[PDB]
Design an enzyme around this catalytic site. Structure first.
Site, PDB file in Angstrom:
ATOM      1  CG  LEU A  27      -1.950  -1.159   1.320  1.00 10.70           C
ATOM      2  CD1 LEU A  27      -2.897  -0.779   2.479  1.00 10.70           C
ATOM      3  CD2 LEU A  27      -2.777  -1.270   0.046  1.00 10.70           C
ATOM      4  CD  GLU A  54      -9.504   1.878   4.216  1.00 12.21           C
ATOM      5  OE1 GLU A  54      -8.541   1.073   4.265  1.00 12.21           O
ATOM      6  OE2 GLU A  54     -10.525   1.780   3.525  1.00 12.21           O
TER       7      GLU A  54
END
Ligand code: NAP
Ligand code: HBI
Ligand code: CA
Ligand code: HG
Length: 186
Positions: A22, A30
Site C-alpha cells: 500500500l 480503514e
C-alpha cells in the site's frame, strides 16, 4: 452469483499500491473497515468469499494468510496449484464465479468480495451483473505504481447513503478519507 461486491482504498490519483504494498503507512481504522465489511455475512453457517490476484495474495504477511474467516480464492494463469493457505485457485474470474456456484460452495457462501488488484477489479467491473463498489477515498497523494481502473460513472451511481458506512469525512494519523458506495444495477 446474483451480485458482486468490490472494496478498495484509493488515493488522489487513484493509486492503490506501490512496490508490492500500500502507498500509505497503516490506517488502523480503514483496515478494520475492510476487515468488517469482507468478513461479515448475514446468514448463519455461511462465510464470505474473497477473490484476489496473485500479487495481492503474496502482499499479505505470510503468517496472516489466509484472510481469517473468509474463503480465499486466488487467480493466476501460471500456478498449477493453490499457494499454501489459499482455499482455491482459479484461472479466470469466470472460473472463479463458476466454482462459487458449484454445490460444495454454493451452500457455504454468502457474499463474494473482489479485493483486487487492477486486472481483477477490471474483470469484475465489466461483468454485466449487479455490483456494489466500496471505495475509500484518501484525500492525499502518495507515490503509487499501481492504479484502480476507471469507473463508468454512467453505470456506477454513487449512493448518497448506505447502512453502516459512516457519512462524514474521517481523519486518522492526520489523514482525511471518505467512504463511498457506488452501485451498478443490471
Ligand atoms: N489499495 C487497495 O485497496 C489495494 C487492493 C489490492 C491490492 N493493492 C495493491 O496492489 C498491488 C497488487 O495488485 P496488482 O494489480 O499489481 O496485482 P494482482 O491483480 O493482485 O495480481 C496479478 C496476477 O494475478 C493473476 N491475475 C490477475 N488478474 C487475473 C485474471 N482475471 N485471471 C487470471 N489471473 C489474473 C495473474 O497471475 P499470473 O501472472 O500467475 O497469471 C496476474 O499476474 C500491491 O501493491 C497491493 O498492495 C491495493
Ligand atoms: C487484502 C489486501 O490487504 C488488499 O491490499 C486490500 N486492502 C484494502 C482493501 N480495501 C480497503 N478499503 N482497504 C485496504 O487496505 N482491499 C484490499
Ligand atoms: Ca505473470
Ligand atoms: Hg495517490
Amino acid at each position: 452469483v446474483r451480485s458482486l461486491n468490490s472494496i478498495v482504498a484509493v488515493c488522489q490519483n487513484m493509486g492503490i499500491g506501490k512496490d508490492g504494498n500500500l502507498p500509505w503507512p497503516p490506517l488502523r481504522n480503514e483496515y478494520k473497515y475492510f476487515q468488517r465489511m469482507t468478513s461479515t455475512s448475514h446468514v448463519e453457517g455461511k462465510q464470505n468469499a474473497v477473490i484476489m490476484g496473485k500479487k495481492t495474495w503474496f502482499s499479505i504477511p505470510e503468517k496472516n494468510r489466509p484472510l481469517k474467516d473468509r474463503i480465499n480464492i486466488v487467480l493466476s494463469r501460471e500456478l498449477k496449484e493453490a499457494p499454501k493457505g489459499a482455499h482455491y485457485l482459479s484461472k479466470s474470474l469466470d472460473d472463479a464465479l463458476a466454482l462459487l456456484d458449484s454445490p460444495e460452495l454454493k451452500s457455504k457462501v454468502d457474499m463474494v468480495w473482489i479485493v483486487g488488484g487492477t486486472a481483477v477489479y477490471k474483470a469484475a467491473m465489466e461483468k454485466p451483473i449487479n455490483h456494489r463498489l466500496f471505495v475509500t477515498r484518501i484525500l492525499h497523494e502518495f507515490e503509487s505504481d499501481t492504479f484502480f481502473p476507471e469507473i463508468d460513472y454512467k453505470d456506477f451511481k454513487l449512493l448518497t447513503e448506505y447502512p453502516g458506512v459512516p457519512a462524514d469525512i474521517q481523519e486518522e494519523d492526520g489523514i482525511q478519507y471518505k467512504f463511498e458506495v457506488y452501485q451498478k444495477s443490471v
